[PDB]
């Protein structure tokens, strides 16, 4: 059987990559950061409580101005908040209430959303009439929309439960490039700072680094034991962190092509739903199923703080571009700003 | 300058919450339902009798609004997207009475899911007329696929329909007890299963959901007062 030889040759290549990564593992991240001083006890406080959502909140995204933010709740509403004054700027009724992700364009002129409808809907916020209307409905995915991120006003990358990711041309509404490497539901994606690459996390316990313009899977990262639910790039773009149902957070390096650190504790037995780094990348914030958010030391793997304000599962979190505050969404229909 | 901009934001905020108040009474008044089942379980026939990733079906019973959703273009991996239906009033699980063992395993996963622990399940044991034809024939026996059926006896609490063979009654109630054994194992008084012997062309399926939903809302209010 030629397939059995292809099964045999695959094991040879996986054994070659494993030994190639072992040769580069001279010293671990803990040994390098063994002499640096710890960050200490991080005690953030809830400064704002955003109230108005009628159902569980699934996703949120900060604007580039670090003031406005959009939130997606399964009641069929997209709300744009002014985090400074807690005032609602826009309330967008959705055609499908089963939204699972939302995005804020870097220019602040558009917002995106999607979910079980398998459609990524683009909404125009800067219409001269003064209302917010859908400008484009991106269809073509055969699974639920799990995450979406704007590259610019005309390009957006999406992840879907059909095990594929896609690059969309908003003007034409057609898929420019399709990424078909994963074997399970792709749950989240994270764009590089220069938007040349992006990483995705799927339900195959593996993460993949993609080339946006080339459309190829450059590196595949393994080490997790369960489905990866969240992913976030390091501020420098040379590393990223993942959150999975195995109650562990892991840090992977692109140039090293292997895992550097694992963030877990024996008292944590619930899966991670969202991950994000601080501005400097020293702190790794992660949302958990146990209604709590844990602040990890990205260099020493030490838990530095706990954000316990929500009454239900924390589904999403995000740090502002200026690093001033951290937002947290949860299934209790509330958003909380932490400083 | 600074006074005109902030005041324009406050008037825009109070206009939004004014609309959100109208959306709240509409959202809280309708009861959302999730329809689940195999491709040949008969759920599609119940929808028409009352591409896209999810279908919507809105019916009204005694001026009470219901919003039943049907899963469309989604893959067979359900462990992720099924978490979105944790706040629905009930999950309508349609089973074609070894496809039966596969439905029993799916029911066990839904019943024991961490996020679905507080969601009741309306069990529609569909295709009761097709089950009777197979039991009366005697060619396809159940005990070869369920050895405990040979030693199974019809419960005296059963309500057989007038003019029905006892072999059909013992067969359909054995399948019901297979689902009830899973529900009564981890019920914990948080959620309950409502089994029903239904057909695809039954007009009573709407009334069964309305009566079961009324019982679910009643048990929720009784739990908030810690009466049950």
């Amino acid at each position, epitope marked *: 059987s030629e397939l059995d030889q292809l*099964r045999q040759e695959a094991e040879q290549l*996986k054994n070659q990559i494993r030994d190639a990564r072992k040769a580069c593992a001279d010293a671990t991240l803990s040994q390098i950061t063994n002499n640096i001083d710890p960050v200490g006890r991080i005690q953030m406080r809830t400064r704002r409580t955003l109230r108005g959502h009628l159902a569980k909140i699934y996703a949120m995204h900060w604007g580039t101005d670090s003031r406005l933010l959009v939130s997606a709740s399964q009641d069929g509403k997209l709300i744009i908040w002014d985090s400074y004054t807690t005032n609602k700027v826009h309330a967008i009724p959705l055609r499908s209430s089963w939204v699972m992700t939302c995005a804020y364009a870097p220019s602040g002129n558009y917002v995106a959303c999607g979910g079980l409808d398998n459609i990524c809907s683009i909404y125009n916020l800067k219409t001269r009439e003064g209302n917010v209307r859908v400008s484009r409905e991106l269809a073509g995915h055969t699974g639920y929309l799990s995450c979406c991120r704007f590259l610019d006003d005309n390009q957006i990358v999406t992840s879907s439960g059909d*095990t594929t990711c896609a690059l969309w041309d908003i003007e034409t509404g057609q898929q420019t490039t399709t990424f078909t490497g994963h*074997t*399970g539901d792709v749950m989240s994606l994270s764009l590089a700072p220069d938007t040349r690459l992006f990483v995705s996390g799927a*339900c*195959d*316990a593996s993460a993949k680094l993609w080339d946006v313009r080339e459309g190829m899977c450059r590196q595949t990262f*393994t*080490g997790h*034991e*369960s*489905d990866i639910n969240a992913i976030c790039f390091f501020p420098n773009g040379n590393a990223f962190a993942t959150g999975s*149902d*195995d*109650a562990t957070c892991r840090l992977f390096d692109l140039r090293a092509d292997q895992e550097l650190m694992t963030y877990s504790h024996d008292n944590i*037995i619930c*899966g991670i739903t969202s991950v994000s780094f601080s501005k400097s990348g020293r702190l790794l914030l992660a949302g958990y199923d146990d209604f709590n958010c844990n602040v990890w030391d990205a260099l020493k793997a030490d838990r530095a703080g706990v954000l316990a304000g929500h009454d239900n599962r924390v589904s999403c979190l995000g740090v502002t571009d200026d690093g001033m505050a951290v937002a947290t969404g949860s299934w209790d229909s509330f958003l909380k700003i932490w400083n | 300058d600074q006074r005109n901009e902030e005041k324009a934001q406050r008037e825009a905020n109070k206009k939004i919450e004014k609309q959100l108040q109208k959306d709240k009474q509409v959202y809280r008044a309708t009861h959302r339902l999730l329809l689940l089942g195999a491709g040949e379980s008969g759920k599609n026939t119940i929808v028409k009798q009352m591409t896209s990733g999810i279908f919507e079906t809105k019916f009204q019973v005694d001026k009470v609004n219901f919003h039943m959703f049907d899963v469309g273009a989604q*893959r*067979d*991996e*359900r*462990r992720k997207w*099924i978490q979105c239906f944790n706040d629905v009033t009930a999950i309508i699980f349609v089973v074609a009475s*070894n496809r039966l*063992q*596969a439905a029993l*395993k799916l029911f*066990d*996963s*839904i*019943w*024991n*899911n*961490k996020w679905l622990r507080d969601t009741s399940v309306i069990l529609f044991l569909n295709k009761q007329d097709l089950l009777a034809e197979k039991v009366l024939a005697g060619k396809s026996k159940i005990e*070869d*696929y*369920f*050895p*405990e059926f040979a030693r199974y006896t019809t419960p005296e609490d059963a309500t057989p329909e007038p003019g029905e063979d006892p072999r059909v009654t013992r067969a359909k109630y054995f399948i019901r007890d297979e689902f009830l054994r899973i529900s009564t194992a*981890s019920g914990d008084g948080r959620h309950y299963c409502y089994p029903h012997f239904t057909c695809a062309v039954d007009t009573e399926n709407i009334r069964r959901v309305f009566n079961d939903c009324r019982d679910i809302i009643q048990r929720m209010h009784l739990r908030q007062y810690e009466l049950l």
Partner: nanobody
Amino acid sequence: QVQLQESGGGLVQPGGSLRLSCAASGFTFSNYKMNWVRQAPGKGLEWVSDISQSGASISYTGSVKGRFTISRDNAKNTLYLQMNSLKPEDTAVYYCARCPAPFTRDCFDVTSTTYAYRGQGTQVTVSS
């Protein structure tokens, strides 16, 4: 890297006996519930049996109850399936399927056509 490799099995006489083994690696074997699934020629994937994390909770499908025996060795990270009184109906490719999430009583999607936490399977043929 989650890896599941099935071993044992093959051609056997009707009424014979076989012992399947699944070597698990890349995850904490003691924290996951294990399953056995099979796919007959021209048929879909079918759940056969499962075993809890510790091994107290054990269930089988109706067709193999009394003939098949499932067990696990947490120290060796190995899943076992003792098949006795094999019939020609048992001819199928047998896969060892792990539940997707640890410390969970539910086990979703283990019979889906494309499941990540499932081995490549081993061929078991029962014929005279």
